[PDB]
Each structure stands twice: as C-alpha cells, then as structure tokens.
Amino acid sequence: SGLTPCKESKQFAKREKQSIKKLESSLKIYAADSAPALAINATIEKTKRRFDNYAKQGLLCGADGLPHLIVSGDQRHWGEFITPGILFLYIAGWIGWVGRSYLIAIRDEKKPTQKEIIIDVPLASRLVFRGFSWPIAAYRELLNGELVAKDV
Amino acid sequence: PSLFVPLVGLLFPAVAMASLFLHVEK
Amino acid sequence: YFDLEDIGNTTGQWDLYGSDAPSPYSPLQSKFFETFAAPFTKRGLLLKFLILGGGSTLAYFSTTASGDILPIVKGPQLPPKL
Amino acid sequence: SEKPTYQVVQPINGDPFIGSLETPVTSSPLVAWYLSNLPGYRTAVNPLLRGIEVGLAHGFFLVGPFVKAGPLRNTEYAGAAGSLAAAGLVVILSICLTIYGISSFNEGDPSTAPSLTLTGRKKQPDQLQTADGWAKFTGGFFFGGISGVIWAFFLLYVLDLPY
Amino acid sequence: RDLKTYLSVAPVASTLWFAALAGLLIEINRLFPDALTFPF
Amino acid sequence: GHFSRTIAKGPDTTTWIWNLHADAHDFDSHTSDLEEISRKVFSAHFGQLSIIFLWLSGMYFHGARFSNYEAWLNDPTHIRPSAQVVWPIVGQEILNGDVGGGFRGIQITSGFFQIWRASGITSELQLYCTAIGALVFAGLMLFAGWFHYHKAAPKLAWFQDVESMLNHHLAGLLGLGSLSWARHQVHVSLPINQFLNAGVDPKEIPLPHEFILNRDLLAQLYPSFAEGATPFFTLNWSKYADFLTFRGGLDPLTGGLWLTDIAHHHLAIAILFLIAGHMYRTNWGIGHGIKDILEAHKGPFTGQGHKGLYEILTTSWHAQLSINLAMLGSLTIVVAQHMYSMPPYPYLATDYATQLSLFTHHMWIGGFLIVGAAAHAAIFMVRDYDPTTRYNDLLDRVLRHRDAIISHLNWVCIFLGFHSFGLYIHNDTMSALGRPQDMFSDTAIQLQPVFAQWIQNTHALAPGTTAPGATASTSLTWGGGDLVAVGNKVALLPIPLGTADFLVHHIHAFTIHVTVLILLKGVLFARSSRLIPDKANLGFRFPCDGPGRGGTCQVSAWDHVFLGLFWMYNSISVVIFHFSWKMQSDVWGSINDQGVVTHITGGNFAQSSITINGWLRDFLWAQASQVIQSYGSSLSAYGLFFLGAHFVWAFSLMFLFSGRGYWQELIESIVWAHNKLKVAPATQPRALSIVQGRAVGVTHYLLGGIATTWAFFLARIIAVG
Amino acid sequence: TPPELDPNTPSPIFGGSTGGLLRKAQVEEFYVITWESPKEQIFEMPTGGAAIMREGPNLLKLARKEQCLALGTRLRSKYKIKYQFYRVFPSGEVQYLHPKDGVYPEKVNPGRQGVGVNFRSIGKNVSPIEVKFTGKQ
Amino acid sequence: SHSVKIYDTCIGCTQCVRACPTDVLEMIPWGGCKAKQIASAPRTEDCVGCKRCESACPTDFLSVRVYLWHETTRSMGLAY
Ligand code: CLA
Ligand code: CLA
Ligand code: CLA
Ligand SMILES: CCCCCCCCCCCCCCCC(=O)OC[C@H](COP(=O)(O)OC[C@@H](O)CO)OC(=O)CCCCCCCCCCCCCCC
Ligand SMILES: CC1=C(/C=C/C(C)=C/C=C/C(C)=C\C=C\C=C(C)\C=C\C=C(C)\C=C\C2=C(C)CCCC2(C)C)C(C)(C)CCC1
Ligand code: SF4
Ligand code: SF4
Ligand code: SF4
C-alpha cells in the first residue's frame, strides 16, 4: 500500500486526459452531426465517467496510475473482492446445488442417461429456485450430503 | 601446443567409434 | 509350379543375378599390382597403418601458415562496460 | 520367353513370389552386359585386382569436387593440394572398408554370396566375401585410391585443359 | 406437437441458455459498465 | 447415433456423443444401398449451396447497409475498404477505425469492393437487390433438397449417366455461364467502368439498363456497336475489335486487367466449352461412349488398362471425390498464382492488404482439398476395392510395385531435404564464422536459376514475335522495362529471380514431395503390408494393432492423412511466407515524382532470405512489430488473435504428446470425488478415443498455427500498405 | 493325427510382385500354404493384389506365418475352403503347424495339453522378490 | 519371445483364439466352467504381442494376459 488514492493521483489523472485527447483527435475528421461523431463522444463520456467513479469508490492506484485492488480483507476495501466474492459463491453454489439436485432425482427408475442428453424435464417439477436457499445445504451436510461408500 | 590436441580429440572418436563398432557386432 | 525341397536355393532368391559374371580375367599388368599392393592386403595390419596414418593430421596442423589463427591484429573493443 | 510377350514386366526369373520384377532396367542385355562387367561384379577374379580398379577410379573422381568446392577454391596455396583432402577421404574410406571386413571371419565358411547364377545353373561360388578376400580388396582400394588421387592432381598440376 | 418441444430440449438447450445468459450479462454491463467493484 | 438404430440405441459413455458427430456424414457406413447413399449426398449438396448462397446474401447486404463502398468508389486510392460495423459494447468500439469516407468500420480484405467496381455496381440500391436475390435463391436450394429426398428422389440409374452429366456441366454451366457473364461485361461492366475511369462519379453515371436499351449511349464510345445489323452476321469480325482486344498487360489508371480483354476471354471460353460439350454419347446417336474409349487405351507396360474404370467411377463416390478434391484443390492453388501475377480487378493490385490475404487464403483452401484427396483415395481402397468384381489392372501393378514407389519417393525427399535446408545451414554457419564468400549467395558462390530466368526472358520478347496480336506482355512480372503505378502505389513490376529464389523453390519441391510421400504411402498400404497383412479388416480409421511387432502405431490410412496434415501446413506456411517477403521486398512500394521506387523492406530479400537467421530476424521479428504493437488501435483484435492462436496451438501439443491411458486413470480419481458428493453422472465420463485425440490435436494445431499468421499478415499489410 | 505332407503342387496365377520373399527365406525361414479350390476363383493375396486361385492342390509360399493365416482365414470365409500351412526352413525339414490337431484351434479337442495355465486367477499374482521369475508363472 | 498366460477365471468363449492371426492359442477340455473349455497358449514362439486376444476377452479383466518379453524376429513381425 505505497499507493496513494486515485483522487490525489497525478498519473491516474494524467491517464484520463491522455485517453480522451486521442479520442478527440478522431472526431476532427468526421465533422460533428455525423454518426462516427457521437460514437466517439459517447465513448468519451464513458471514459470520463469510469475515471470519475473509480476515484469516488476509493481505489488506491499505484505509481503507474492504475487502480490496484486490495484483497487483504480490509473493511475499507471489501467491495473490491469479498462482497463480489460472496456474490460469486452464492451463484456458484446455487448452480452446483441445482445441478446435483437434478442428477439425484433422475437416478431412480427410467433410463437415467436419457434425461442427461435430453432434459424434456425442465427443472424437473420445480428445481431451480431450490437454489435460492442452497446454503441450507449445511443442514444437508449434518445428515447425508455425502455418501458413505468410500472412506469418510 | 593447443593446435595438436583438439585433433587427437578427433582422432579419438575415429578410434573409439571403430573399436566400439567391432565390440557391438561381435 | 516350381518348388523343390531338394534344392532350397533356386526356391529362394539364392541365385546370383546375371550381373555375376564368372568370366576370364584382365591383362597381366596385375602381376605388378599384386607385388606392391600386398602390404595393404593383410587386414588389421592395414587398420593400424591407417589409424597411425592419422599422424599425418597432427603433422599437417602443427605446421600450417594459412589458417585463421591470428587476429590478424586489432585493438579490442572494451566493450559494453569495458 | 521371347518375343510375343508383347508386354514388359516378366516376373523376376520366372518367380512371381520373390519380390522384384523383370524390367528393362532390371534385365536388358545392354544393362545386363554392363552390370556383369565391372570390378564389384566379375566373380572368379582376384579381389585385389578388382579393388584396384574400383579404388583407382574413385580416388580420381574425388579430387574434382574437393578441389573446386574446397575452402580454398580459389588459391594457389590451395590450388589443388586440397586433393590431399580427397586422399584423406580414401584413408578414412579404407578404414570403414577394413572394419566392415571384420563382419566376415577367417573360418570362414567362405562366402555369403550366392552359390548359383540365375538360370539356376547351380555351379560355382563367389569369394569376394570372406576375410581374406575382402581384405585384399580393401588393400587394392587403398592402393587404387591413393593413386587415382595423385594422378588426377598430376594432370591438374599442369593441366592446360580446361584452364 | 410433443415433438418440437423435445427437439428444443437437447444441447440446443445450451445455446438458448447461454444466449439468454449472454444477453443478461451484456445488458447488465450496459446499465453498469466499467465495473471494477461492488459498491453498495 | 440418429443415423443408425443400434447406434442411436442408448448412451452409456460419453464416447457415444463424440461418435455421433464423427460419423454424421459417413453415409456409406449407415447403409450398403448405393442408391440411398447417392440420394443422401445429392440432397446434401443442395443444403450446401443454400449456405454459400446465404453467405453471399450477407456479403451484398453488408456492402449495402454497413459499408462505405460508395465513398470508396470516388476515391479508391486512399480510402480503406470496410464492411461490417461493431456495436459499442464492453469497449468494442475501438475496432471501428479510420477507413476514410467519414465512416467507422473494420478494414476488409475479401476483395468484394474490387469485384463490385468491376461489375459496374454503383449504388447500395443495386447491392440491396442482389442480396435479396441471393436470399431468394437460398430459399430455393434448401427447398430443393427436401423435395429430392422426401418427394422425388432420383434413381441410381439417373446418377450413373455420367456422359450426359459431363456434356452439360462443361457446357451448360461452364459455356453458357461464361457466355452469360461475357454479355454483362460489354453491356454493363465495360460501359460503366469506362465512365468510372473518366472520373465521372457514380451518381453521374447513367443506370446500366439505359446502356442496353438504346445503343446511342453505348455507341459513342466503342463505335462498332453503332451498326444495328452488326458485322457479326457479315462474319468479318474485324470491326468488333474496339470493345474487345488482345492487349493484355495492365491498365495504367485502374491497375487491373483490361475488361476489354476479359470479355473477349469469356466469349472464347464460352463456345470453347460449348463445343467441348458436344462429346459424349447420349440418345440421339452422335457422341462418345467413355466406356469404349477408356477401354481402347492399353499397353505393353499396362497390359489391359483402364478396362473396368468406368465401372469403378460409377459405383464408388469416394473414388470420384478423391479425383475432384485433388484437382479442385490444385485449381485453387493456380488461381492464387494467377490473380497475383495478373490482377483482374480495378484497384486490386494497389490494395496490398487484399492481395496478401487473397493469395494466402487460396493457398490453404487448395492445400486442404488436396489432402482430402488422400483420405478418400485411401477410403476407396479399404471400402470399395474389390478385384473379384471390378478389376482394373492399372490399380494392380501399382499395388504390385508399391514397395518400389515409396522407397524411391523416400530417397528423393532425403536428397531434396539435404539440398534445400542444408544449404541454409551452410550459409548460417559460414556467416556466423565470418566468411560470407563461402556462402551460397549472389555475392559469393552463386546458384543462378537460369532455367526460370530463361522462360521469363522469352515471355518478355513474346509480343510481336511469337505473339503478333499481343501488344503487351501477359503479366508485368514478365514485362522487362514496364512499370504500372496506380495512385502512389506500385501495382506491378518485373520480378527478378536470383540465388535466393533458387533455394526457396527447392524447399517447395521438398515440402510437396514429403507431403506426397506420407499421403501416398497411406493409400497403397491401406489394405495390406508386410507388417500388417490384414490391415483392411481393421478398417480405414483405427488407432493401431497393438504394441506388437515392436509397435504398430498409426498404421492406419487415417493416421497417414493425420501426419500429412501437419506437413501440408508446414508446406503452405512457407509458400505464403515466400510470397509475403518477396512481394514486400522487391515489388510493393511507393513511386515518387522522379520515378524512384522505394520498396517496403528495401530489397533485403536477396541477401537475407538465404539464411535461417535472416528469416527469423529480418522477416519475423521485424514484421511482427505491427501485430505486437496494435493494442490501443483499430487493429486491436489482430493482436489478441495473435496471442489467442499461439494458445490454441500450444494447446494442441497437450493432445499430441500424450495418450488416453493417463487421462482415463485421472478421471477415475475425479469420478471418486463426484461419487462422494452424489454428483456422479449416469453417463460415465470416458477419455477421448486414441484416434480422436489425434483428430483433436491436429485441428487445434492447424487452427492455432494458421490463425496465428492470419493475424500476422493482416496486421502487417494494413498498417504498412 | 498324421500330417498329410505337401510335395509338389501348382502355384496360383499371379505374375509377380515386390512384396515376396527376400533373403530371410534363404537364410532363416519361409512359410508355405496349401488349399484346394473347387473353382478357378480370384482372391486378393496379401502383399499385393489380384491373383487367380486355380483349381486343384494349390501351393503358395509366403513369409511370417501370419501372412498365411490371413490368407487362410480369408480362404475359409468368402469361399468354403479348407487350408493348411507349414514352415519350410532353409534345409528341407518338415514342420507342420495349423491346423495341427487337425481340428481348428477354436474348436475344443480331446488331447491337447494346457501349457501356461494359471489356476490362481489374475490379481492374485505376487510382487517381487529379487529371485528369478516374475510372478505370473 | 513373448510370454502369454491363461487364467481359470476364463469362461471358454473362444474369442481370444479367433482374434489371433499367428495361431498362438487354442481351446482345451476343462471342468472349471459351463463351456467346459479353456484357452491354451502352446505356440508362444509365433506370438507377435498385438493383444488382439485381450480386446476380445469378456471376463471382468482379462483371462488371457500378454507380457511383452524378449524380442525375436517372429515377435518383431519382420518379413525381411
Ligand atoms: C422442412 C423441414 C424438415 C423436416 C421436418 C425434416 C425431417 C427429417 N429429415 Mg430432412 N431435409 C430437409 C428438411 C426437413 N427434414 C431439407 C431442407 C434437406 C435438404 C438439405 C433435408 C435432407 C435430409 C437428408 C439427406 C435426410 C433427412 C432425414 C430426415 C429425418 C431424420 C432427421 C435427421 O436427419 O436427423 C438430424 C436433424 C437435423 C436438423 C440435423 C441438422 C442438419 C441441419 C441441416 C444443419 C444446418 C446447417 C448448419 C447451419 C451448419 C452450420 C453450423 C454452425 C453453427 C457451426 C427426419 C424425418 C434423414 C432420414 O430420412 O433418415 C434416414 C436423412 O437421410 N433430411
Ligand atoms: C469434397 C468435400 C468433402 C466431402 C463431401 C467429405 C465427406 C466425408 N468425409 Mg472428408 N475430408 C475432406 C473433404 C470432404 N469430405 C478434406 C479436404 C479432408 C482433409 C482434411 C478430409 C478428411 C476426412 C477424414 C479424416 C475423414 C473424412 C470422413 C468423411 C465422411 C464422414 C465424416 C463426417 O461426417 O464428418 C464429421 C464432422 C466433424 C467431426 C466436425 C469436426 C469439427 C471440424 C473439423 C472443426 C472445423 C474448425 C472450423 C472450420 C474453424 C473453427 C470453428 C470453431 C472455433 C467454432 C464423409 C463421406 C470420415 C470418414 O471416415 O469417411 C467416410 C473421416 O474420418 N474426411
Ligand atoms: C497451452 C497449452 C496447454 C494448456 C492450456 C494446458 C492446460 C491444462 N493442462 Mg496441459 N499439457 C500441455 C499443454 C497445455 N495444457 C502439454 C504440451 C503437455 C505435455 C504433453 C501437457 C501435459 C499435461 C498433463 C500430464 C496434465 C495437464 C493438465 C492440464 C490442466 C491443468 C488444470 C489447470 O491449471 O487449469 C484448468 C484449465 C485451463 C487453465 C485451460 C482451459 C482452457 C480454457 C480456459 C477453458 C475455457 C474455454 C472457453 C470458454 C473457450 C470455449 C471454446 C469454444 C469453441 C466453446 C489444464 C487444463 C493436468 C490436468 O488434467 O489436471 C486436471 C494434467 O494431468 N497437462
Ligand atoms: C536432363 C533433362 C532431360 C529430362 C529427362 C529427365 C527428366 C524426366 C524424367 C524421366 C522420366 C521418364 C518418363 C518416361 C515416360 C513414361 O512415363 O512412360 C510411360 C510408360 C508407357 O506405358 P504404356 O505405353 O503402356 O502406356 C500406355 C498404357 O500403359 C496406359 O493405357 O509407362 C511406364 O513407363 C511404366 C513405368 C513407369 C515409369 C516410372 C518413371 C517415373 C519417373 C518419375 C519422375 C517424374 C518427373 C516429372 C517431372 C515433371
Ligand atoms: C477469508 C478470506 C480469505 C481466506 C480464505 C481462506 C484461506 C479460507 C479458506 C478455506 C478452506 C480451507 C476451506 C475448506 C474446505 C473444505 C471442504 C472439506 C469442502 C467442501 C465442500 C463441499 C462438500 C461442497 C459441496 C457442494 C456444495 C455444498 C455447493 C455445490 C457443490 C457441491 C454440490 C459440490 C482471503 C483471506 C483468501 C480472501 C479474503 C477472504
Ligand atoms: S499406445 Fe496406442 S498406438 Fe501405441 S501401441 Fe498402444 S494402443 Fe497402439
Ligand atoms: S498378443 Fe497377438 S499373437 Fe499373442 S496371443 Fe494375443 S492375438 Fe495371439
Ligand atoms: S477370451 Fe478369455 S474367457 Fe474367452 S476363451 Fe479367451 S481366455 Fe477364455
């Protein structure tokens, strides 16, 4: 953390100006009122906006003038990894739990492989939303989240 | 001096390859 | 059609292709060659003579004026940091 | 087997179960006559005499390439002395010949060569093979090679045609 | 008409699913582009 | 497997899924009924034609709505040809770059812009119609296949009448096709382009149909059109010579072949294909029995010959497919080497970016198709070769002395390999040791290609002497002292041939001979071998026959195509490299006011392409700087694809250097982890088959390798040209 | 069973090839195969192509043994033909192999001798052990 | 040459024999299974070691096992 925040940065600020000047260089040959015109100018506002937002949310920015994320767990920078990370695992589990729940329901009777290549069973009866509460799989763990066939 | 030895370092492969050839076909 | 356990040779490509020629000979000049090529006909003795004939290679390199073994002269480069 | 065959590719010596076939290149009187002659062939002749012919011819041939394409093409100093190089090759080439001759012993069950001509005459042996025979031949080659080398240099070390 | 449904229920399902997923993701990026963090 | 019932049966392993696609088009493995197969493939061709037709519709459509073709028309010299536009999402809009004409788009290299100008197309209105007409055709073609498989499928007897099919295809399609196009040229292409070369502007050009109706507009230029009766019926034909000529060479203002020549060309080609169309026997007497004529040729060397061929090439698709693939591929290659030397389109040669990519594209397509000929030729030997019913005798003997052909071809490759690559290793060693006199160079011991230099010499002195009607040369690479310069760019110039040109041709001799070796060895030894006397019973596509006999890996004819596939890559990959450097170094460049010509790399080909280090530095390292510095610019995608290809390529080595036994054992440990958590699929996961792993390997190798140059070349010529 | 023996028989029509015997036959071994055809048919012939079968005893000389069986197994299929092949050697000698018992190996016969039969069952093999043998005895 | 063994876990389906192109195996009267036959490996000298026999075996793991040992011309599959 030798980095000083993107607000009091001279490099990250300089980098903003450099990028928009190059974009401005391009619209000079098309004449305003034209299509390639807005597209360039629309790109410029997005450029200004993203530079503006990064300074707001914190983001430390190294000497190179680009934001560096801090994943130490620091409460000041939770939004840089932990909060998106919690969101990922949620969806990651949800997918995992829904998929597992499917192959389980299929196994008894029928031709199980038939359901795997073709699933004219959609979410089975109603399996998707079951993922809304996947984390309750912790309670599935205390019972039989795992099979006892091989080892423990 | 050093212009006598790298060739015997090349006479030696000739000698070694010949001897070994006789050894392996025997 | 023609397989004969009696002769196993013609059965196989045992026969010398007509390129064999077991004909006469060549002029009497041979009487000369047989006299002077004899020491090299012994084998093993010749193997040695040729290897020790490698003493020629040593002699030829110990004494050799025109092979690049001299700079010829220059002032050498320092050169990246001396 | 002549001559209304109206076709070329007679099975090798009448045997269609031995791999090879009869073609003009394989068997044409001109080719056959040519092949029958030469030192490698010409069985029943002294091996030393044959090596000399072969050796002498090759040694002479080797000089040209070495002298012309040598590191000193291109030099009085290396005007043709490179022929010495051609000579060295025949020194080495005589080793390879000598060591190969040790694959034939002196017992020697002389000759691994076929014991019959085509036409299955069933008569005669070859003798190039065998320890004594092969060795004579090398010695001839060595002799023939060194000489062919010197002679070719000779003419070149005088020449006049073609400068 | 049972047949068309099944037909749409093979690996094509994957394309439709990933097309729908892509559309969602792109549109999310339209409304919230250049997102390096979750700040709420 | 949808195609077969047992195949469809049920899935127990994942191998079923891979097999399903692998034998999807393998029509002769689904039935033994020849008629059923033929009916299948015939409909399949319709479905193909629909796709390429749809493909064309999108090219015309995009040219209309998403291109600056009109803008390029007025100022072709320094406007960059661009079709297709990128939506401004997740930062994409940077790929939209300055291409001139006040337009933002990706610069293209297909060459449609040059095609459209030649056709006399002037407005998006015209492109819009052609797009719809193509879609209408695409609807037909797709419908036509459905109609000829479910409603009215032809008999086997229909397909077997090859004589009738021949007569039509090289007359009804070729002849009238050439003739029909010949008409559009002199009525639309030639008049309109004549205006375009006069700087009249497209909107100031009258509409094409006004040229056809009243002769007045078309007659003021090319006054032979003035006579209503026309001198054609007078059969003098000398009067017509104004709109068509045998001038040849190149127009100094448009840089393409004179349309004045191409019209005459098609006029000749048309009837030449119309006459040659009247050859084979049908129903009304006059004609040939190809069966009869084929039988007639026999020989002291061939004994019976060609007898029985007609039976083979009328009952075996793979036999016909091999022949067609062998020459259609060969045709694509000569197309590449005829369009570069004789630029047939207006402002084509000037557009260096298009020319490099056109030549390179045709070389790969031609290269691939030829390799495919090897496959189906081998498939024929395994599946359709039956001496009992269809003996040829030509095929025999070939099989009879097959150990001979391969052994000789084996030797030639070694001779060529030494006498090609070795020379370079010589030069690389003599230069490193500080003795350039020793090297094979124009400055030292030179190996001049006097034969090629002599053929070019006679082509230069051809007009007037052995070609009176020819005013100028065929191509300006055979010119002598001529120089065409469209814009500030050089369209074409006499191409020199030196010792550096002697080496590279001998490398192409090599690479082609080895590629032939691998493929031809797989075809002849497809059925039997001393090693495997019954290989034909193992099929065409099998991995092996065990570790026995020391090891019998890749003995299949399939694997010979697999090995020869890399070599076809190695081959072309160096042809296109020869093309790129030679054109940049000794042809392409800018011409000044005085007449001094500066080439892109400045004639460094002659003394630096004789070294391996020279290609690695002066060519690769040098000309890469564009692709590796394309970040933050319009050519951003090429930089990424350059890196992206390098990956799919190194990704192939994973499949090629290993075997499935390792992977299956690894999966075992992974299946265990699944069974612990109730997440084991009923469809048991299996590793790829031994043969599939090779198929997967070579595809990614070719993709990553080919793709990687694609980005190489397209980044280079665009930034420089 | 008494081996029948082969003396002289005519060879099938063919005209030659480059896949025939070569030197190995002269110095090590070569294999011959005999079969009787009820018709002058046409068979593929390994290591080449197209040869007329002939009608009669039919005698053919090949190499590797395997080449003979391949032909023989094709000879038993397609055409309902019985066949037998031997290993000639270079100095006469009469080694007759296959069928041998006189009844095909695939068909169980009364007095053959097991040779290399393990009544342990696989997976019950040991681990070395620096002593001679590998454990799959 | 190569070393081949047969195991009592065999069921006498005779597919290993039909697969062999050199005739290394054969069937044998036995009392161990319903077929009352069992594979035999008398002629290991002609064995090339291609494991065609193993790819025809239906027993859970092979009743016939080929152990590639010393190499000979016959095992090397040479015709020259
Ligand atoms: C009009 C609608 C229609 C319908 C309902 C059918 C229905 C059927 N067809 Mg027919 N067919 C049609 C149109 C249709 N077809 C057309 C327009 C053609 C001309 C090309 C054909 C040519 C054809 C042949 C040769 C055969 C059939 C067969 C069949 C039967 C089996 C289906 C099958 O082949 O497996 C699979 C179903 C598919 C849809 C496979 C996909 C193939 C399409 C064309 C892919 C499209 C190309 C794609 C864009 C390539 C780019 C991919 C890219 C994204 C990477 C089934 C009754 C088969 C049969 O009779 O069984 C023995 C058969 O032999 N069809
Ligand atoms: C004249 C054109 C032509 C035609 C009509 C055929 C027809 C056929 N071929 Mg042939 N082939 C050709 C050209 C042709 N081929 C050429 C030029 C080659 C040399 C490369 C081959 C090499 C070849 C082999 C090795 C085989 C065939 C086989 C077959 C048969 C069935 C195989 C199948 O269904 O495909 C299946 C289709 C797939 C498995 C799809 C594979 C995925 C492709 C290769 C990826 C392509 C990448 C893409 C272009 C770019 C990347 C896109 C991606 C990133 C999204 C069928 C008769 C098979 C056969 O056994 O014959 C009966 C066989 O094994 N062909
Ligand atoms: C660049 C080439 C390359 C790549 C990318 C890999 C990658 C991998 N190897 Mg491999 N390997 C290679 C070359 C390569 N190898 C070579 C030359 C050899 C010597 C023969 C080996 C020998 C080898 C062995 C012995 C093993 C591996 C293993 C692995 C896996 C390790 C798991 C991992 O770290 O990340 C996971 C995967 C990746 C990082 C790459 C996945 C590719 C992308 C990221 C997937 C995304 C697809 C994307 C959506 C595009 C879609 C395409 C579209 C057409 C659908 C990984 C898949 C091991 C393994 O299998 O562990 C499980 C292992 O046992 N490799
Ligand atoms: C030094 C410069 C002078 C050039 C001469 C040397 C260069 C040319 C090489 C000589 C080849 C001889 C061709 C004889 C002309 C010729 O081919 O004769 C063809 C000859 C004719 O047979 P028939 O008369 O029976 O043909 C009619 C019937 O058989 C068919 O219905 O058939 C054979 O020769 C069978 C054996 C094949 C011969 C294989 C040799 C193949 C050579 C391979 C090299 C190809 C080079 C191509 C380069 C483009
Ligand atoms: C905090 C943090 C961190 C750290 C981390 C760590 C270090 C941790 C850890 C961790 C660990 C060390 C963990 C472990 C574990 C374990 C186990 C043993 C597991 C399991 C599991 C399971 C069983 C799952 C299942 C499932 C589910 C539930 C979902 C879906 C899927 C399935 C279905 C698959 C860092 C600092 C980095 C970042 C920031 C934050
Ligand atoms: S590793 Fe594969 S190709 Fe090699 S012997 Fe084994 S099965 Fe055959
Ligand atoms: S490995 Fe081959 S030769 Fe040996 S027993 Fe098995 S099938 Fe017979
Ligand atoms: S495959 Fe196995 S079970 Fe069948 S006969 Fe051979 S050893 Fe016995």
From TrEMBL, chain E:
GO terms for cellular component: chloroplast thylakoid membrane; photosystem I. Keywords: Chloroplast, Membrane, Photosynthesis, Photosystem I, Plastid, Thylakoid, Transmembrane, Transmembrane helix. Chlorophyll a binds at E27, R30. It comes from the Eukaryota. It is a single-pass membrane protein. PANTHER family: PHOTOSYSTEM I REACTION CENTER SUBUNIT IX (PTHR36082:SF2), PTHR36082. Belongs to the PsaJ family. This is Photosystem I reaction center subunit IX.
